[PDB]
Amino acid sequence: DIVLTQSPASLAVSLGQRATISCRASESVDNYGISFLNWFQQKPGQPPKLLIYAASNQGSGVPARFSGSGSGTYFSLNIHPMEEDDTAVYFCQQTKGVSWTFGGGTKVEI
Amino acid sequence: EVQLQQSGPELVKPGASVKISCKASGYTFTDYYMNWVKQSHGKSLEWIGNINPNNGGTSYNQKFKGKATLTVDKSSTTAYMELRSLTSEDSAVYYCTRSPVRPYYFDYWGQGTTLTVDIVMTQSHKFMSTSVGDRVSITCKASQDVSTAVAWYQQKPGQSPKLLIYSASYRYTGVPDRFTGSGSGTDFTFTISSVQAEDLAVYYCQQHYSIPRTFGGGTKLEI
Amino acid sequence: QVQLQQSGPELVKLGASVRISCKASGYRFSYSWMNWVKQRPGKGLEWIGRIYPGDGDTKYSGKFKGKATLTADKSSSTVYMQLSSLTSEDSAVYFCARSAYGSEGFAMDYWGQGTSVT
């Protein structure tokens, strides 16, 4: 199993400010160009809805306030200035085989 | 919601050029081909040629070597054609259809536009006389080895044809359960149990084993 | 479109068996996988396994082989997870998600409603 952690545990972003969240791991899952690292967003009562295709391209049903880029052993999701309706938890997901491991998650507050 | 629009007819002097178009809609234009089917006056069907929209290359029959070409347009999803050296024997009706890939069949069919001016499939006699509701049979023989690429169509006088059977063994979506067939290699049969007045039309035996595709002569149920 | 419908909830006692299903519809399930995720109220997520229908390959990790048996069938077009020898500490929330292809990075585009296994 590949070790996959998350930092920080809780972030306090004011109204109109930007932030970032990363996923610490030993891999470097950069095999055949496709970055094998996904992102999720679980709300209380809602399933962990998908955000970005392999941390490089925005998917369907996702608002335009989310983006992501990076390279190597360190990614950084770009978040727009958030409102009060973004109270959820973001996760990490390395999808390189054959065993998959998930992140710990961070608490999003204002 | 697959629909193919057709242009109006026109009277062209022999020897001049003609332009025929049909806009594709309801599906992705790059996922399927754009095939043309000749409908000769008072006779069977004939194949014209196929165009590849992703590369622009085309393949056609040997009779269209110095007669016609095939171009498409990705910005409008409408194919263009230009026949040259018209004669009195070219009194026919052009068609536009939808075709899948591997195998190459003909699912949908257009309304058509009239123009005023290999493995061959041999069938049985066309004029069969049976009573209404009896089990009928249609015999179609192959000249060479055809594994499973046998199809059957239904064309009414004044109406457009349609796909009925899938790989000569199973039904298509939108087809009643009265149409069933089988066959293996050379003994290709087709039967309809408990026929009605709605199924009283012209049938066709088909072959898709090798390029160029060659259509059959045609049969008629009376009844 | 594509939907994933699970069954109803089930109460967990000592020695009971709980069968959870997830019906696939609107797509070809023989050319994709079927992921399962653990979820506990107050904790995070955890990966369990995958089902690739058509040939029967199933991968297990995270010591879930002792209680979870992942079996599916192509004729009825759904998956099954057979639970056995349950305790009070095994209470969690199970979800089934449709995995995307390798060009998109095996992402979970759609999700189910989730059952309360407690």
Place this chain on the structure above:
Amino acid sequence: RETWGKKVDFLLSVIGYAVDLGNVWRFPYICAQNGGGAFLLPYTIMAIFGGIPLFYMELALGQYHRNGCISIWRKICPIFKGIGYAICIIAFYIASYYNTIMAWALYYLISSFTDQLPWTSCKNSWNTGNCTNYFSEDNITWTLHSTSPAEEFYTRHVLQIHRSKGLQDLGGISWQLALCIMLIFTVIYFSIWKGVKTSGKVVWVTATFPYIALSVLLVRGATLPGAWRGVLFYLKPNWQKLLETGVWIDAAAQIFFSLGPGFGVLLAFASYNKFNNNCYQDALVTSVVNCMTSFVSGFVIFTVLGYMAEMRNEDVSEVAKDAGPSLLFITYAEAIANMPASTFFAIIFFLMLITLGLDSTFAGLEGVITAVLDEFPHVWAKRRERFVLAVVITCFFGSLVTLTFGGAYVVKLLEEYATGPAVLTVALIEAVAVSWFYGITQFCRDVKEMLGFSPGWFWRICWVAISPLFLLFIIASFLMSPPQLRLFQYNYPYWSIILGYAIGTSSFICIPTYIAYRLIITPGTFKERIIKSITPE
């Protein structure tokens, strides 16, 4: 000068350079497309006229002169020294793209070592939305944009064509495929450093292993359903196609590409040999069996794709619409995984493509190291263990443009546009050098003194008339119109023929330069300095 160990040693290497892995796809595909069984009729008339005697004269110069590639022109006509310098840089140019062909098969050997092959299922990280090759019960269809699982393992993982765009961006070489080059090049270095002593023993295992592999693969296709459809399209005579002038030239280029004479590789075999052997019997049996191998190896491919015509339900021309090296790794590779006991048949076939490639590059390295030794004595190859090590590293660093992510595009332009007309232009210029300039009346005197009899009426006329005119018709129609090399829906730009011809003529520009190099340094009357450099000492 040393010689070979036994008599049957150098008879086994001449056939081993004659056969390769090209004889299983380049020959029988043009047979099925160009009239079926009628294509074998120009195969046996153009062989005795252009193939066989040009194959025979290359041994006769090597038997008498017993010298290398560059030193045979010192005692015939010294202005043609540019011929031996041309074939040296093509040996660096061939080894760039040719070793990547077995490197795709060497990666297939370690991939198919497991029990579960990745070709019978789409359980991988490819474009799985188009990977829909499962043949269900009449609930299967593929859109124009669908692909094959053998193609997705060939394009996404091995070549990585999605990481590049074409000739404008080649980028960073695959590290997994670079390790296969080191496994290939180790066996090449450990067999040529001693000379003909180790070259006479390594061919004893590698030249008969594919021949027994053709026997065990034929019995698989013999008791195989649907194999009669493959022999039908292969053997049916269509005499309406032979009236076209195009099928005559393509049949003549096939025999020249199969045997491959005049490149300098084979004359190194006759240099280390006694003069008493019958060169007529040694050359006649090699050209006869090479048509027999290409006839047998056409049976082991077409009987298997006839089963693919049964399951996919099309014609055999539709399943074999591709034209190139992709016939083995896309169409034939997926047919092995659908068979019972697929773990055994996948290894013996993909090791057959390994051993047929290494016999051609075993002997190709001998032809370039023998040339530098005799022309410059006590300067190059004083230590034979060190100087051939400098040769193998140059084609290793030269192959870095072929191990890229766009490596599939560069092997297509270098096979056909660069090394295609280059092998004809170096072979036509040596054919007129021995016939017209050296003299046909002088050439047969050296053959009859080592054999004991004069050649017949057929060999005298064909050396002066047929063999120069055989290669002229092929090089003329090739420089008629530049074709469009279509490789995975990517069309090449208009300047691809410009860069393709410029790298191809770089060896062809050496021969008018090397004839101009000697007329400057040799002084005297302009008629006398030329005729001194035609007549040897």
